[PDB]
């Protein structure tokens, strides 16, 4: 029932493999749909004047033993991103950050979801009730670990990590 989406990942100029993700559309349908549509790029051009699509965007902030963060396809540095909806409200906090390899929304406070997201690499319970958890990695866990190793304490990647393709 739940959509399954993927990112193909390159680290530097080198294809790393694919992260395959389940989105919890059954419990978090608005948040899952935004992410699904940003993987396919099916909504076309956005309000920022760029494609509403993760393809070509990077994991711009990577912290080892914490998480990997991406989805800023408008500014590429954490200051941008946009939802298919034009920010949206925190849908619910049904799921918690109780495991690595969960997908959750980055934000800039309450009810500011756009396109940025993270994949956890540890439990992040201090984020419960503040970031909407909306899926998990099904396959490609080792790719997430390879991305994570490219992180830094200041979050700056030591090698670029690109979503070279995305979709269903």
């Amino acid at each position: 029932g739940n959509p399954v989406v993927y990112f193909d990942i390159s680290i530097g100029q080198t294809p790393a493999g694919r992260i395959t993700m389940e989105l919890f559309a059954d419990k978090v349908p608005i948040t899952a749909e935004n992410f699904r549509a940003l993987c396919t790029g099916e909504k076309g051009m956005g309000q920022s004047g760029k494609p509403l699509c993760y393809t070509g965007s990077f994991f711009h902030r990577i912290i080892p033993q914490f998480m990997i963060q991406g989805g800023d396809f408008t500014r590429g540095d954490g200051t941008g991103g946009e939802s298919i909806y034009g920010k949206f409200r925190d849908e619910n906090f049904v799921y918690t950050h109780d495991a690595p390899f969960l997908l959750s929304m980055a934000n800039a406070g309450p009810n500011t979801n756009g396109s940025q997201f993270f994949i956890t690499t540890v439990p992040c319970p201090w984020l419960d009730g503040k970031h909407v958890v909306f899926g998990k990695v099904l396959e490609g866990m080792e790719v997430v670990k390879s991305i994570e190793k490219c992180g830094s304490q200041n979050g700056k990647p030591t090698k670029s990590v690109c979503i070279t393709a995305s979709g269903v």
Partner: peptide
């Protein structure tokens, strides 16, 4: 600290 924000990364 360990947050996941979009614009002003905090401690």
């Amino acid at each position: 600290x360990l947050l996941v924000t979009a614009g002003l990364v905090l401690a």
